[PDB]
Amino acid sequence: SGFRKMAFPSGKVEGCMVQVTCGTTTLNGLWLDDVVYCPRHVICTSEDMLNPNYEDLLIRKSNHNFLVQAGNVQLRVIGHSMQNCVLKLKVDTANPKTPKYKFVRIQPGQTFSVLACYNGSPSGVYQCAMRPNFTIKGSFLNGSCGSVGFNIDYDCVSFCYMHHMELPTGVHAGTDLEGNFYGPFVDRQTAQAAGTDTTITVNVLAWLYAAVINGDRWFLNRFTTTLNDFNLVAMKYNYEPLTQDHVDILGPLSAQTGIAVLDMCASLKELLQNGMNGRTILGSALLEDEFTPFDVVRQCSGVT
Amino acid sequence: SGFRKMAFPSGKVEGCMVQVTCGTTTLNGLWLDDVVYCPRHVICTSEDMLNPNYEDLLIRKSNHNFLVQAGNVQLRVIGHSMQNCVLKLKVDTANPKTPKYKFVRIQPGQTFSVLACYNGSPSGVYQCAMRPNFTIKGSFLNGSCGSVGFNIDYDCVSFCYMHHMELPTGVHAGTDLEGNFYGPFVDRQTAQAAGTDTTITVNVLAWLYAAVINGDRWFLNRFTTTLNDFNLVAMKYNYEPLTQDHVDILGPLSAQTGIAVLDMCASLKELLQNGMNGRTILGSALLEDEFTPFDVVRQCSGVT
């Protein structure tokens, strides 16, 4: 009972965090096997950062200009390469704490945990979603670059995010672990505007099911709707369209609560049209969209 | 930039979690040095649970009736004792992953991280506060008993909470690591009502400072107030009274923002009197009270 914004336990990722120094820039790296992953902008002098040519800047850099410190022990760099916007530093020592892992590129609406780090050391963990405009609304200060986002499935860490950038609007931009930015952003100190931050409709539905499972039912109404009618309303309210793929993924929550997905859609529709009237659902005065259907099933069934 | 509900990294506590079985009841234990801490109700048959005499039930229990499994390796129990509502199982092996630690009893309004565990295995981490009625609003299913709440200061884990009980209202009750319940609750299957869940005023103020630091300023007004006038309003709105001790602890946030504590009090007063008018602060449509002043300073200054 109770429904909390919950992060994956951070221990497996804590054991991968190192400090990368190049010149006067220190940020965080991810040490997996004998490779340290970090943002390539580690090589920039924030005067470079205005219009960097990373290939050209990298010519001036050797293995020994990359300082990699794990705990307070130095790793020997025996190779370096650039993959998109990340540097891969080959070290002479495989991380003895390497978990089973994958690199996954997630879709907008997918949630993950961030281990916020400074100087290769963890400060905190929180739950995030990839916004539909491919930003995340994180908590990141100077020195946090290289901090990673991840999901855990039993023993396997899926790394989905590395932190690169703060947009001038104070939202956050970064890469998958192959160094490809989510969204159109570039690792450059240039004004870059984010698109519309729409609500992740499928996630709101999942969280309305979590609320029903936990006893919060006041918002359940006598209406149903169709996919097309609901989507007209979603559009008007800057909600992502709902697809049959979203309806399918919600099946187990529909199943447990006996509330048809389109019925829950008609309940959400009325919440958009009438607002909450000063009421709360699961202790929130607005509709939470950073729980996936998978996250609700996980938390509601006690998965480890 | 950005302000997130943030938990301490969970790795140091993950390495302490074990599974305790007694009879047919399995829950979680905390293994620190050569001692495993768990809720004493592990020895109850939920028929015992109606009116248990723990001393009497413990007479029927030997070292070998307590099954303690760490990973999938069994610990040999060489002693057991009861301290208030917890059992202390002496094992023959000191936990090699024991962090530096303390047991602390926290006050209502203090925040901590919970590592929710099932069968000695972590499922997730979230941030909590000890409510002023000495409940916490957690996320806990059957098998979660023994899950702990904690704070970290650099390398030292302060354990403040062990999970014992779900009240019939779906809020949560438990002990410090000396086995003393927060609040008046007893480890018994008997209807136990929680008192008024008032808002932690000092924490709301800290989070209003965090909002100002992060650019959310719309709620700042032209008024100030006094401690006595503010407290009249707090009382009317089921907010905890504000003391000079709360004002003192807020000093650094006052200092950075140049907003006198009593000025921020007058801003909160107007938010209580006028509500948010459909506006948000730090992405919330209500006033968050699960950030302490210490938590705001920590997150806003990047402490590891």
Ligand SMILES: O=C(NCCc1ccncc1)NC1CCCCC1
């Ligand atoms: O340097 C910065 N932001 C750029 C650094 C950064 C990088 C990735 N994520 C978040 C932040 N802010 C400073 C802090 C102190 C006050 C004046 C602005």
Ligand SMILES: O=C(NCCc1ccncc1)NC1CCCCC1
């Ligand atoms: O057994 C229970 N609660 C008691 C167990 C418990 C203990 C500590 N925290 C939280 C929960 N609920 C069951 C679950 C399945 C549906 C019917 C009620």
